[PDB]
């Protein structure tokens, strides 16, 4: 009897209909001449990797896999689905059935067939597969990542790895817009050199391979001219640039106005509409144009319930078919409650797109953002149909947060941030998952102390125990059971971090090594802090002064190190104990 393994995203409808079976060492593959070319390739790679040959001639003693779209006429597929259908599902949806030695995948479309294979890939462990009936489809139609942060852009290998990762987690969107790419912004008029164009072609190809919509962004708002011959020429620079990417296979475009001095709302929107008509519509196979206005968070967009000048004019002018993005109530913010999306969706008379600034850390680079999607309302799909996160300049560790973004945007109403966070680490880290949880748990909250605040609080259960300890002490209750419990946690933090330093692969380790060192330091300082509490209780001056110096030494190291972690928990505990 075989269990349903960790899946991501959570499929909408899944039932276990049997004990499971082992897939034979050779399979009958059926329907692959007509089935989506990218789905079949994904399936082929997986089979090759897990040592499963494909039969050349049908063999009834071996597992049979049937794959295809609704719109392929393949009856042997409908037979194996057994009354289950993908016909009535939304675009990108699929049906999957494994029972009695047969696996059937039917996509609503090709995107759907590819995603069906991704779920198949997740269900198989050591050749064993549960027997299940699945119908599955996304809540949000556009799901993915906007590479739009400041600082060192992702590398070519970073992006290729990310794209394979998106496909595997059913994220279908990747927006290329790095602030510090000179040709994206600072020098938006200039053509990419030939070798950079070759790297582009590679990313486009890989995107198509993984069903990801590569969105080419451009940010001309610094110095674009709007009127007369200059406006013509500048407009034609957008066309030329977008054309050269179209000609390599790009079918999505974004034009961004964020973080600029010029606030000509009407002219911004006019550029959009013109590009929408002379480019997006003319081409006819190009997806809806994406944008961000110069006012892009509720605070900057709205004043006493009514839109500000720029926003009101921009909403009035911008074409209805154009996707408009906003960051929520602030630039980096705790929540997007339903009522915020309702307000903004109302001003724009449309479904909105989110540019969610988590896990991005360009505003506070000492900390890793390693928590789940948090504070985003689970009914958000009522006003939002396009969801993307802005990641860190650290591609590898961004995967933890993105994993949870895949789940939240695919199956929104079922989303449980703690379960999704745990699953992300479990799926990504393997043997090291438990220890990574211990570390990452202290690194989920982003707070620059002023305008930027978001994410699940740092290790809340520990903070609760710490708070509880100060209560037991100031009301002189017997604290000794909690003190042993707490020595264990501090020991554990140190044990786990030492294990990660020793065993994490380079690709993860070179992103978090300074923060590991930081949490070990703080754990050691928490330990001395308890020694301080215990020695004060035991009226032992020798032990108290010795522990105190050690506690201050650890805090001094953390205060002056670039790495920042557990500010309000592991760090604060030491500060609290020195009073």
């Amino acid at each position: 009897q075989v269990l349903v393994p960790n899946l991501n995203p959570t499929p909408e409808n899944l039932e276990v209909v049997g004990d499971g079976f082992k897939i034979t060492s050779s399979i009958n593959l059926v329907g692959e001449e007509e089935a989506d070319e990218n789905a079949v390739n994904a399936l082929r790679e997986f089979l090759t990797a897990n040592n499963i040959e494909i039969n050349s001639e049908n063999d009834p003693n071996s597992t049979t896999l049937i794959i295809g779209e609704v719109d392929d006429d393949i009856p042997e597929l409908d037979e194996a689905l057994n009354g289950t259908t993908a016909e009535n599902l939304k675009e990108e949806g699929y049906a999957l059935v494994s029972n009695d030695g047969k696996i059937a995948i039917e996509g609503k479309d090709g995107d759907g067939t590819f995603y069906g294979v991704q779920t198949f890939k997740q269900l198989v462990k050591e050749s064993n597969i549960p027997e299940v009936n699945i119908t599955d489809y996304p809540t949000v139609s556009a799901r993915g990542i906007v590479e739009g942060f400041y600082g060192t852009p992702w590398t070519h290998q970073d992006r290729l790895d990310q794209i394979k990762f998106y496909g595997e987690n059913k994220l279908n969107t990747y927006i290329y817009a790095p602030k510090d790419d000179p040709y994206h912004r600072e020098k938006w008029r200039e053509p990419y050199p030939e070798s950079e164009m070759q790297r582009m072609q590679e990313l486009i190809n890989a995107s198509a391979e993984n069903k990801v919509d590569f969105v080419f962004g451009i940010s001309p708002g610094i110095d674009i001219r709007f009127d007369g011959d200059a406006g013509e020429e500048d407009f034609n620079h957008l066309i030329t640039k977008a054309e050269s990417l179209y000609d390599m296979g790009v079918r999505s475009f974004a034009i961004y106005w964020d973080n600029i001095q010029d606030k000509s709302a009407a002219k911004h929107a006019q550029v959009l509409n013109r590009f929408n008509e002379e480019f997006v519509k003319a081409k006819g196979d190009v997806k809806p144009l994406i944008t961000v206005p110069t006012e892009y968070d509720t605070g900057a967009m709205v004043s006493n319930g009514q839109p500000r000048a720029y926003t009101r004019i921009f909403a009035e002018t911008v074409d209805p078919s154009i996707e408009v993005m906003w960051t929520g109530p602030g630039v980096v913010t705790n929540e997007i409650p339903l009522s915020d999306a309702q307000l903004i969706s109302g001003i724009y008379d449309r479904n909105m797109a989110v540019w969610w600034n988590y896990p991005v850390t360009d505003y506070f680079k000492g900390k890793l953002a390693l928590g789940p999607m948090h504070g985003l309302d689970k009914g958000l799909n009522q006003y939002v149909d396009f969801f993307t996160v802005n990641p860190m300049e650290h591609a590898e560790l961004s995967k933890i947060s993105i994993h949870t973004a895949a789940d939240y945007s695919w199956n929104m109403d079922n989303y449980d941030y703690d379960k999704a966070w745990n699953r992300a680490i479990d799926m990504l880290y393997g043997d090291l998952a438990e220890d990574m949880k211990v570390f990452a748990n202290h690194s989920t909250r982003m707070d620059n102390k002023t305008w930027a605040k978001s994410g699940r609080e740092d290790a809340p259960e520990l903070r609760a125990k710490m708070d509880e300890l100060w209560n037991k002490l100031s009301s002189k209750e017997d604290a000794s059971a909690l003190i042993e419990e707490l020595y264990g946690e501090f020991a554990r933090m140190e044990e786990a971090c030492n294990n990660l330093k020793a065993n994490l692969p380079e690709v993860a380790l070179e992103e978090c090594s300074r923060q590991l060192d930081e949490l070990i330091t703080l754990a050691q300082g928490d330990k001395a802090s308890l020694d301080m509490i215990v020695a004060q209780l035991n009226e032992d001056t020798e032990a108290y002064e010795s522990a105190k110096e050690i506690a201050q030494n650890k805090l001094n190291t953390a205060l002056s190190s670039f790495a920042v972690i557990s500010e309000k928990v592991a760090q604060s505990f030491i500060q609290e104990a020195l009073s």
Binding site: Y150, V331, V332, N357, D362, Y363, T450
Partner: peptide, 6 residues
């Protein structure tokens, strides 16, 4: 230059 906002 290095990040958004203030």
């Amino acid at each position: 230059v290095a990040h958004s906002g203030a």
